[model samples]
Target chain A: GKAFDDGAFTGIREINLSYNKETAIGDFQVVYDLNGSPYVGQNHKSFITGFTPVKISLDFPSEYIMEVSGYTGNVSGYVVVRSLTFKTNKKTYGPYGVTSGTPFNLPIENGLIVGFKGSIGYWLDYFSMYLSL
Target chain B: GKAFDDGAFTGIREINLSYNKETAIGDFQVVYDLNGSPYVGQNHKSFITGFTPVKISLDFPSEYIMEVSGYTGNVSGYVVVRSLTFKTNKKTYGPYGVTSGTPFNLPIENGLIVGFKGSIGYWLDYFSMYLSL
Candidate 1:
């Protein structure tokens, strides 16, 4: 494989999470495949105003990975979801923020959920989790 | 004259509001063709969880028309937009709410915005204003 063109390398994919059964609440993968691009084209944005970014996370059946960013503003705030940190069962990767009409896509390699860290806010708006794969 | 199936006359249409030239400021049609069903099929909702409803309005060349509804809950709040009022440069026509997996569709006949009233809140989520015709 080739280097994924680092330095502002952006990518996006959908993430599906379900409330699954678990033995303990320490760590788990609430979702399975974290690298699937289900959409067929360059995802476009529908202009929605007065939006607030809520912290979104996934638990890998047991462990975890999470991201945390700033207070994505309200008027035109739905766009702030792109700036977030990536945490894993072992390490942490970013608080990356992209500024453009287009938001940045942060690729997420599969990882445990309980093992990660941080929170974005009180709620989450994930009708479509346009997070990176 | 026809009875629009009174029990629950459900209908939907997209509205396009633009900024037009004005001679003076009182009342005008900011958006024309308040009755166009642009989408081919029954508009399906793209599952978006944790969303809040924002007050969306349109201003004619001069005056305006607006709708006011309750706080559409966030976990599955976006669907609340179906509940709205239709105002014109002259009259007011609703406070309707729908409750089915399928949302209710309110109609907005062509009217002058400057003569109407009410606000949803401090924001709006009108990427595709799925309000009725």
Candidate 2:
């Protein structure tokens, strides 16, 4: 029973896409801040430490392919038409699961993913981004 | 008195991405479908009519730089790290306003856009797409 935000509720920010290159495509990414805490980087200031400032980042594989990094660790969600790839760096100390494997692509969920606790809690019907461990 | 859902309430679907190509930054796009009416495409299916099935579509120039299209037309909101662009197709007659012109890029909000009615209505603090208009 934690507090969560719904992207659709804000409707417009649903696709906060960003880029930093040139041409038809480039190194673009979108970040969904899970923890509302603005003091994300300033962990030392508050009790919250570690990667608690978690978020789900979607990247366009600048490797030269129209692919979306599914990212299996911290971030999670569907990349519209892009292929769902993966990225991981889990730390076992938290609910992040076995955080000992290298970053890699998991499977494509077609065009849907989220960062929530399973299919319940704060982020319902979306991937779990570790809002609360 | 518009009812906004609030992104944080859902915290994970923040970046619904999609792609249909290959290489660093391809034709990757995201669509933030407005109107709770799911029959977006099938206008004839329900009472909803016209381009009311509005949504914001962000695309990478692909030509090759790290940029985001801050579309000025129907869609609105910010693009992270990427340049803001615009898209327009005002159909006039309705709240869409002067709906008659080619789509083009407007100034960048640095990184934000949305498809709402002015700065109020269905959408609160995001780019004003064509939600009620």
Candidate 3:
């Protein structure tokens, strides 16, 4: 029989079943009929005097959408977000400045984490969102 | 014949003697020989968040010289001196922006007070000078 008592046996079996079932049963049934789904939430807060670095991670299936929202407080002066980027093991994309007074929501079609470097006076508050396919 | 019994007698006699002696002793003696000279120092300090009004007065004989100096601290950001002017009961003069990293000095030949209105972050330190004939 194909059944086994090892941890890899159960894990690999579930992955294989999902892969094969997705092809046979189609995308809608694979997504809607699944008994369990995976998702994670992450938040970050920091106080910085000059330019500092920040990194955020998201864990979800590929081809998913994400939304990020946050507030920042000015100390001595306002903080400026210089640049942000998305990075994976294979490639890096983007060094974009976040628009003020707006939440950032976008698609994440690959396993990637967003990283940023910017000048913050004292504090910056932030949160992020994502979805799994 | 008796000594003068009136206060005016003594005061007037001194003025007359000084005048007569100056005419005999020459013009240089009127300045150097006289021991009573007048000088005064004035300093000002303030903490201001927007446009604030400041006034300074100098008391001296006409046709005298003066020197002024000050230091400013930045809060939330740096402070800017928007405009300064010299004013009197009869007339109003300049509105000039102070230069950075330099002291402002000028001679004052009339009875007037210097007035200014400008922006300051939290604190501004200042000192002034004047000479009298």
Task: Using lDDT, give the best candidate's number.
Answer: 1
Instruction: Note the Cα lDDT for every prediction shown.
Output: 0.26, 0.21, 0.23
What is the C-alpha lDDT profile of model 1 across B4-93, one tens digit per residue? Answer: 111111222222211111110111111232233222222122222222222224333243344322222222244223334455454453
Error of 2 at B19 (Å): 39
Clashes of 1: 30
Q: How large is the interface RMSD of candidate 1?
A: 14.9
Stretches of model 1 off by over 4 angstroms after superposition:
A1-12, A16-119, A125-133, B1-59, B62-83, B86-133
Off by over 4 Å in 2: A8-47, A52-85, A88-106, A114-133, B1-133
Worst 10 residues of 3 chain A by lDDT: A9-18
Q: Say which prediction, candidate 1 or candidate 3, comes out ahead on DockQ.
A: 1
lDDT by residue (A25-54, candidate 3, tens digit) is 000000111223421111122332223232
**Candidate 1 lDDT score relative to the true structure:** 0.26
**DockQ score of each predicted structure, in the order shown:** 0.01, 0.02, 0.01
Model 3: residue B40 alpha-carbon error in angstroms:
80
TM of chain B, each: 0.24, 0.22, 0.23
TM-score of 2: 0.17
lDDT of 1 at B11: 27
Candidate number that wins on DockQ, 2 or 3: 2
Global local distance difference test of model 3: 0.23
